């Protein structure tokens, strides 16, 4: 109605990787002008599963920012393209931010969606305030057992031919092949019937995804290439204590390797205290995991997101002076000294708040 607004479109198969438009759900915040957050769900996962998380009055996330539950290419409602390059998918978000008139946004992700969110900060750091990654890390996960199961489920899902198979044939095939209960439920909800009861099909492009996973090479979604580079902004990582995707022993090192400003464990990298359970990857289903993720997310958005690198928190905005490098300013008659870095309005490009406040400033003087 008002808070939940998902723009309706039809996926278009595109030959050019630049003519790709992303669709998703928009969640309006409680207050008038708030920065926006763009969040990516796990690969082949519904955006609607995160709606109760982002609209929970106890967590009160919308009090901080507007949330875009956006689908990547070949997923859900967005356009389809055979390439899964993280740079090409990152440029999709920039065209989405432009068409939606968003100057800069916070990026979030779950699982593989965490890699996608962090990749956008790697390729467009000036348009991204921060990255909040849930149960993911910028590392090659092609050989993790959790990814192999997901890779195996997508491969088995290519066997089903929707024209010949009946509905009862599909239900039996999924229960027997997909043993994970959550992956089974997610894949069933991705099945949808086209207009005029033409046939059934998965919402995500099963052909393009299977070739990406089955090939198991550098462009796979499980892999993180060196080509992606380094993210220079604020990054926060949260994952379960016993997670099949992020192992606390060594899978934290990629975060320091890719993110330049990560301080370490206990500051930007936390683990949710929990038991061994293969379903603990889906933090929004369990209140214990969801409460900790939401509190850490509120702390990131409130005090650490979109703050200059050399400032500690948002509390230092306007009272902490950063040293300046010599011969860095165009003015020749400039006395070099410490300064407080400029923080800009979240959508200053598409509004005239700086022009309006200039005129109000002249009325004072």
């Amino acid at each position: 109605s008002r808070i939940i607004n998902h723009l309706r479109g039809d996926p278009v198969y595109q030959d050019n990787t630049k003519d790709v438009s992303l669709r998703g759900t928009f969640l309006r915040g409680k207050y008038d002008d708030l920065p926006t957050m763009i969040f990516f769900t796990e690969a082949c996962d519904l955006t609607a599963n995160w709606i109760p998380f982002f609209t929970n009055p106890q967590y009160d996330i919308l009090a901080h920012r507007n949330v875009w539950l956006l689908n990547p290419r070949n997923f859900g409602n967005s356009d389809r393209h055979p390439s899964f390059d993280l740079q090409e998918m990152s440029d999709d978000v920039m065209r989405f931010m432009y068409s939606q008139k968003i100057s800069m946004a916070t990026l979030g992700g779950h699982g593989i969606g965490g890699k996608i969110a962090l990749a956008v900060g790697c390729y467009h750091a000036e348009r991204v305030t921060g990255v909040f990654s849930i149960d993911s890390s910028p590392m090659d996960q092609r050989y993790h057992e959790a990814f192999k199961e997901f890779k195996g489920y997508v491969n088995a899902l290519t066997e089903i031919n929707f024209k010949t198979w009946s509905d009862k044939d599909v239900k039996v095939f999924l229960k027997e092949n997909i043993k994970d209960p959550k992956w089974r439920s997610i894949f069933t909800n991705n099945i949808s019937k086209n207009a005029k009861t033409q046939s059934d099909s998965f919402n995500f492009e099963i052909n393009y995804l299977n070739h990406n996973l089955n090939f198991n090479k550098a462009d796979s979604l499980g892999n993180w290439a060196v080509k992606n580079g380094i993210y220079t902004g604020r990054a926060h990582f949260i994952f379960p204590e016993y997670s099949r995707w992020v192992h606390l022993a060594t899978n934290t090192l990629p975060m320091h390797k890719v993110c330049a400003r990560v301080k370490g464990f206990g500051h930007d990298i936390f683990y949710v205290q929990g038991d061994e359970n293969p379903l603990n990857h889906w933090v929004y289903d369990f209140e214990n995991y969801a409460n900790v993720v939401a509190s850490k997310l509120n702390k990131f958005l409130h005090s650490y997101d979109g703050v200059h690198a050399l400032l500690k928190d948002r509390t230092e905005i306007g009272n902490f002076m950063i040293p300046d490098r010599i011969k860095s300013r165009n003015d020749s008659k400039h006395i070099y000294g410490d300064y407080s870095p400029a923080h800009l309005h979240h959508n200053w490009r598409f509004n005239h708040i700086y022009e309006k406040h200039d005129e109000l400033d002249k009325k004072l003087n």
Binding site: A48, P52, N189, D285
Partner: peptide
């Protein structure tokens, strides 16, 4: 089973009687 699916998403324990009242509310 759309009514069952949305309730399942919110993790609300639903009885069979509630589902019928909601279906009748839409159809009626």
């Amino acid at each position: 089973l759309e009514v069952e699916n949305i309730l399942k998403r919110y993790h609300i324990n639903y009885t069979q009687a509630l589902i019928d009242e909601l279906v009748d509310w839409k159809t009626g």
